[PDB]
Amino acid sequence: DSPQSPQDDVTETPSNPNSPSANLAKEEQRQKKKRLKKRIFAAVSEGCVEELRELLQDLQDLCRRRRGLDVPDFLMHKLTASDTGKTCLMKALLNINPNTKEIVRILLAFAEENDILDRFINAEYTEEAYEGQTALNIAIERRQGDITAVLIAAGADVNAHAKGVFFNPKYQHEGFYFGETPLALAACTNQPEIVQLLMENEQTDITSQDSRGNNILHALVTVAEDFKTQNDFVKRMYDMILLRSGNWELETMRNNDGLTPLQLAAKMGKAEILKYILSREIKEKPLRSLSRKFTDWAYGPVSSSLYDLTNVDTTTDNSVLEIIVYNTNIDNRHEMLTLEPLHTLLHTKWKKFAKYMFFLSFCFYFFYNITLTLVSYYRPREDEDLPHPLALTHKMSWLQLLGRMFVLIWATCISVKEGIAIFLLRPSDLQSILSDAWFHFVFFVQAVLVILSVFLYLFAYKEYLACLVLAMALGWANMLAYTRGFQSMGESERIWRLQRARTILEFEKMLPEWLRSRFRMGELCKVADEDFRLCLRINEVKWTEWKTHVSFLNEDPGPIRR
Amino acid sequence: ESERIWRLQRARTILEFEKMLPEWLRSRFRMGELCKVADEDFRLCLRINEVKWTEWKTH
Amino acid sequence: CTNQPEIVQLLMENEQTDITSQDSRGNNILHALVTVAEDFKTQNDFVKRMYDMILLRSGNWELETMRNNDGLTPLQLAAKMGKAEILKYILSREIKEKPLRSLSRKFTDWAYGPVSSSLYDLTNVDTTTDNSVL
Amino acid sequence: RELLQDLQDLCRRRRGLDVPDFLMHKLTASDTGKTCLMKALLNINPNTKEIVRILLAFAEENDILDRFINAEYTEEAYEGQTALNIAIERRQGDITAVLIAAGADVNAHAKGVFFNPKYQHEGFYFGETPLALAACTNQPEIVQLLMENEQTDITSQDSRGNNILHALVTVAEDFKTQNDFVKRMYDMILLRSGNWELETMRNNDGLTPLQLAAKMGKAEILKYILSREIKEKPLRSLSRKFTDWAYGPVSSSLYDLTNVDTTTDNSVL
């Protein structure tokens, strides 16, 4: 769906005065000031210099008239407040000519000939779609750092906020979302010197937030593509903030949704950025504290890799691995899991427990199919109308009581599990109940149907056997979901990966204890005097790209010494 | 492709009902009356659109 | 029509060269040039740029508003014959030059990063005159 | 230089019985047996070319350099490692020649808890000889520079009795995860200097380097070890491919078939 919703005025067209612009006559010769007002705007639109010099000259001569101290806001009212409050600078900065530099410094000097220029420079729109729009952004748009330095020499508020409707409620329509700050705008639009120039100002906040509570980086998260483009600046912009930032805490900042930028980068699905954020191979010495990848020791082509692991696995609320499985609406999740703190960690958690505990509930169910098949083919039936959906065998030699509290209580163990496993997510008719809640629904439907035979016994219903026979053959039918662990039996592979990626977190949801499965090198020394923390990971490297390795941790051991 | 056939079909409608528009056709068309870049050209504009490919090198 | 631009320019050098002339079907230079593009695959797409070349060389709306012997607009003649590709060109065709703006049809003013305003000329386009292109 | 000036003046105070011995204790930490130089070669720096040259001149002026330069790692975890051994891993071939100009020993066998199984246990079994890891880490000119020295032995064996070749067999692993230099390095050494004595050598566990590729699964280099035609008159014997009757789209083929068939025990087949 691509409308544009132009809702408010059509914002600086060469159109007619179809709008009512008959407010101030004050006539002395067929029109006094509307001829003065608009011919300025056309001179603003064109750049005729001497005419504008004569325009400004009689303008101040028009403002020479008797006002006392009501002249400056008159000149505000004279120059602005048509419908939107737009200034000459706004109109001048939209179009461009080679005359543009000279006409500003003339124009800038005029409100410097008065004392309202600081009130004048930070005009913004009453215009509802663009409430908060300043002249800076337009210069940022049209890439005039030459003018922008004079705007800094004018001293405009660099930390303004364009919180109009110009950013959208939808996804990629009716306007872009640079996050309302003048710093982010040149940052999003690849003006690195200006980015360097803007961050050089001491008045420039960086840690300020959006309406949506966002830093500059959250905007940058909402930029990137789905692939390695023709060398996008988005990645090489990101660090140039961070090395100039000098602080770890900026990514610890949350948003209106209370999310880390990296955590937001999961939901936005921007993989290549997320590959970049996760590495941080900081080579440059004094700020290697904020790195995230660490050469332990290299010694040739096989080094001991070491990742960050601080918000990654489910040890806190809404870990970044918790997003990538449990978020839908990203059609690149299968390929994102190629990365190493993702991929290998799943190989880790499969290893020490998930090969164990999955095959047990496989075997608990496989023996449950044996206790469900045999009791309705050996003896369901004794000769007239006595049903026995669960045969009792009141006498000695306890055979049929041993299966009964095995069948019906394990029927509760799937019913209580799946009755709550469905009470986490509400799918909508496709792709999350047909791929994610596909078999667990059948797991839940088989759960309900076994206990359903008990209420057929209440006053001897007819449905005791033809309904209960459906639980058996469908009980053998959902075994395809439980031949999932074999590599040989399981792009549908990558779908199958993501399907058993659903499983592994589900069993971690079934680890209520103190997690004696300790999957990680705990709280080791990072390159700091104090940060001997941020529990860890160890991985292995092979042949290419032979370079020397300056930064490391220890003087070539492989394991811990002693 | 049958949707495009439907695009013909609802196109066949919209002319018929527009043909059935009574005595005044007024102001049920578009945003117009633009001042074209001329001294005598005052006719008939229409509204705005969008594309999302700011993306390039730009040095 | 056979993709020979310099001799067209050389034809445009002569003062005696009429552009306004009609034919057996009352057709100008443009009308027939409409009738042959056929494709994008089986043409290297010079007809678009040749059609561009002539109007910027010399042209007014008199040359566009002309109708043929069977009474038909050269805009509409593409509309009847199915010349889809040149109709894309005949629609927007923005020109930035001050004594050349009037012959354009695309008018971009409110353009901002990834957004860009759009205006169309909409002359024989709507149903306010008979035989619209629509 | 200040520490060098101070220690020089401090060494002048005790010269009654140990001027060479007392200094050698100072230059090397007693724990690991690592020198200042060994620290200097791990911790690299884009200033280090002078920093060694100054260091060597001090050991030269006090005339203890050859004891110092060809001193080894002596802490029995990854023992026997020279400072030179770092420099090839540090791939600083330029100053490595200065160590060659210093007269460092090209024969060093660094034992230790590396070259072990279970690759995560670092296990870099290049076979502990300084020739190997130059060629094992794709460094051809310094291999040529190693071939320049007369003292450079090729014939040497190891803990597993392995030559230069045997270990070089044990690392190719692939064609995808290697740019295939092992083939051309293996080519480089035999044409540089070689006889069948160097091929017929067997290891400590008694095994042919032809057969060692056969046991370990090094498929790709086995393609190279089989045909390997060389046209040069004092070089034909080391070849194995013999093309004579070749005509347009047809070409005769001959193979050497020495340890190949089942006429000796443990054939490659």
DSSP A492-511: HHHHHHHHHHHHHHHHHTT-
Who's near A235: CB < 8 A, 6+ residues apart? A224, A272, A273, A276
Strands C115-116 and C111-112: antiparallel
CB A88 within 8 A of CB A107: yes
Strands, E, within A270-413: which ranges? 304-305
Q: Which residue carries 């805009």 as its tokens?
A: C75
In b/e form, how buried is each residue of D199-210, taking b as 16+ CB within 10 angstroms?
bebbbeeebbbb
Strands C111-112 and B49-50: unpaired
Q: CB-CB: which of B35, B49, B52 is closest to A14?
A: B35
Distance from CA of C24 to the nearest CA of B (A): 34
Experimentally, the structure was elucidated by: cryo-EM
Q: Work out the burial of residue A176: count CB atoms within 10 Å of its CB; fewer than 13 is exposed, 13-18 middle, 19 or more buried.
A: buried
D-chain residues within 8 Å CB-CB of A548?
44, 90-92
Q: For chain D, which chains pass the contact test of at least 3 CB pairs under 8 Å?
A: A
Which secondary-structure segment (H or E) carries D250?
A: strand D250-251
CB A389 within 8 A of CB A461: no
In b/e form, how buried is each residue of A297-308, taking b as 16+ CB within 10 angstroms?
bbbbbbbbbbbb
Backbone angles phi, psi at D4, to 5 degrees: -70, -40
C-alpha to C-alpha distance for A133 and A509, rounded to whole angstroms: 48
Q: Which residue carries 């995808």 as its tokens?
A: D176
Give the pair of three-digit tokens for residue B11: 């196109």
Determine whether the interchain pair C102/B54 forms a contact, defined as Cβ–Cβ distance below 8 Å: no
C-alpha to C-alpha distance for D246 and C6, rounded to whole angstroms: 60
Interface test with C, best of B46, B53, B56 (most C CBs within 10 A): B46
Backbone angles phi, psi at D251, to 5 degrees: -160, 120
C-alpha to C-alpha distance for A517 and A313, rounded to whole angstroms: 13
CB atoms within 10 A of CB D47: 7
Q: What is the resolution of this structure in A?
A: 4.8
Query: C119: nearest CA in chain A?
Result: A13
Backbone angles phi, psi at D126, to 5 degrees: -90, -5
Q: What is the DSSP string of D62-123?
A: TT-HHHHHT-B--SSSSTT-BHHHHHHHTT-HHHHHHHHHHT--S-----SSSS-SSTTS--
Touching, D vs C (3+ Cβ pairs under 8 A):
no
Residues of chain D whose beta carbon is less than 8 angstroms from a beta carbon of chain A are 34, 39, 42, 44, 77-78, 89-92, 113-114, 119-124, 133, 136-138, 173, 177-179
Cα dist. A226→A186, A262, A273, D189 in Å? 22, 16, 10, 47
Closest by CA to C90, choosing from C133, C129, C43, C29, is: C133
Determine whether the interchain pair D114/A559 forms a contact, defined as Cβ–Cβ distance below 8 Å: no
**How many A-C residue pairs are in contact by the CB < 8 A criterion?**
18
Strands A539-540 and B49-50: unpaired
C-alpha to C-alpha distance for A376 and A395, rounded to whole angstroms: 20
Give the pair of three-digit tokens for residue C54: 């002539």
Helix (H, G, I), strand (E, B) or coil at B49: strand
CB C30 within 8 A of CB C55: no
C-alpha to C-alpha distance for A141 and A185, rounded to whole angstroms: 8
Query: C119: nearest CA in chain B?
Result: B46
CB D136 within 8 A of CB D125: no
Q: Work out the burial of residue A356: count CB atoms within 10 Å of its CB; fewer than 13 is exposed, 13-18 middle, 19 or more buried.
A: exposed
Closest by CA to A178, choosing from A167, A169, A165, is: A167
C-alpha to C-alpha distance for A277 and D166, rounded to whole angstroms: 43
Which secondary-structure segment (H or E) carries A539?
A: strand A539-540
Distance from CA of A45 to the nearest CA of D (A): 57
In b/e form, how buried is each residue of A72-83, taking b as 16+ CB within 10 angstroms?
beebbebbbeee
Cα dist. A325→A318, A354, A499, A519, B49 in Å? 11, 17, 9, 19, 37
Compute chain B's Rg from CA coordinates.
19
φ/ψ bin of D63: left (φ > 0), alpha (ψ from -120 to 50), beta (otherwise):
left
- DSSP H helical segments within chain D, as ranges? 2-11, 20-27, 36-42, 48-61, 65-69, 83-89, 93-102, 130-136, 140-148, 164-169, 182-192, 196-200, 209-216, 219-226
Who's near A337: CB < 8 A, 6+ residues apart? A324, A343, A346, A497, A498, A501
Give the pair of three-digit tokens for residue A215: 């830093």
Q: Strands across the sheet with C111-112, in order?
A: B49-50, C115-116, C111-112
Give the pair of three-digit tokens for residue A542: 């092979």
Give me the count of residues in chain D.
269
Q: CB-CB: which of D42, D137, D179 is closest to A555?
A: D42
Helix (H, G, I), strand (E, B) or coil at C110: coil
Determine whether the interchain pair B50/C110 forms a contact, defined as Cβ–Cβ distance below 8 Å: no
Cα dist. D89→A303, C10, D49, D179 in Å? 13, 73, 16, 19
Q: CB-CB: which of B18, B37, B51 is closest to C116?
A: B51
